[PDB]
């Protein structure tokens, strides 16, 4: 599946300038406008800005002072910047293709002459009364602003913090004799003591998806995160089928593949 | 600015609900409202644009309307997978000044209840040899998505060292959660057993592990 891909630090210290980039030209950067949307924990979506094939830039008024958006149709990269970040700026940052354009419209309850069914001079104007059109109140059309997000990236989680990056320690959650459920058995991997979020987990390089659940992380009093990923598998396979959890911690540029071996009882 | 939405709406399975998006003439009244669906763990998905037009892949039971400064997203034949956060959006004085609503969390009532399956993992041999110990209680396939977890050492309630996640949806739309008890290897080996007790809808399932086993 083709995507828009965000890139940038997962961890940034307060006040620094968050620098991100979006890179994808299959969604023709020459024929599509790209925008940036963020969502902080427990808050609603928030517009940041956009830029089209030309370089025409529009910004969230409340944030335009700290926002700067450029592009490079050469490298096919739109790049956003956000200065003087704070903990309020920790959020998921989404790259998106966006539909923007101003179109001529009529006030609510009015219709264009041609929409009323009138053909002739004056058909491009707005009319309050489509039935008795020759005596209808009439207006020249006004600008109607059109916006919607067309394509969404997967998003990049950015954490604003003074704490330091830490890669995970991965331990097996092995199935045992008393811990099965008849035909099936639960096994998993414990992903311990990492910072910042996020961690993703797959099994057997993506070949195993049936029965997989990766839990959200817990935040410990230590300030570090831990999570678990579990898969329910056939009990009769334990021993013959190899199970490997693939842990990705992009904030530390770490990947771990951990074989989960069954217990000998 | 922020468009006004109800924080929470409840619809019954197989029935219909409407999510309201109230704005002003400079945004909603400009006549091009869009809607977005956000399921935890996934990226947002565009549902509606231009007040009434469905995006690619949006079933017919999702419909959008508008009357003046108020827009409405109506969802009929509610399914469990419709539970999500829904946001409206509109330009304001410029097709590049977008404003989103405050968001609505949709709950689908009348879903079938399910008691949780619990698996309690003892500390791995590898973790113990690294001089740490974590008991891991995984709780899955339950509904509604609310549980309370208590831990015991032998028969003593254990308070400190417990971390528990808020339940979240699995791929099959049932809920899962996890609880952790951090111990020293010495505490693990000193006690005769440890237990995780999961309470769900007035009933409790307890799983126990002992260091004298595998």
Residue numbers in the entry:
A (entry chain H): 1 to 82, 82A, 82B, 82C, 83 to 262
B (entry chain L): 2 to 9, 11 to 27, 27A, 27B, 28 to 95, 95A, 95B, 96 to 106, ...
Give sentences from the paper.
The unique CDRH3 structure can be separated into two microdomains where the antigen-binding disulfide-bound “knob” sits on top of a long b-ribbon “stalk” and can bind to both surface and receded epitopes. Ultimately, we isolated a total of 8 and 11 cross-clade nAbs from cow-485 and cow-488, respectively, all of which had ultralong CDRH3s, suggesting only ultralong antibodies were responsible for cross-clade neutralization detected in sera. BnAbs from cow-485 were named Bess, while bnAbs from cow-488 were named ElsE and assigned numbers based on their order of discovery.
The ElsE series of Fabs all have highly similar knob structures as expected from their high sequence similarity. The ability of the knobs to twist and rotate with respect to the body of the Fab likely enhances the ability of bovine Fabs to access recessed epitopes. There is no convincing electron density to indicate tyrosine sulfation modifications in any of the antibody CDRH3 regions; however, BLI experiments indicate that Bess7, with 3 tyrosines in CDRH3, contains one or more sulfated tyrosines. Low sulfate occupancy or flexibility in the CDRH3 knob region may explain the lack of electron density for these groups. We chose Bess1, Bess2, Bess4, ElsE1, and ElsE2 mAbs as representatives to be tested on 98 viruses from a large cross-clade panel. The ElsE lineage was the most potent and broad overall.
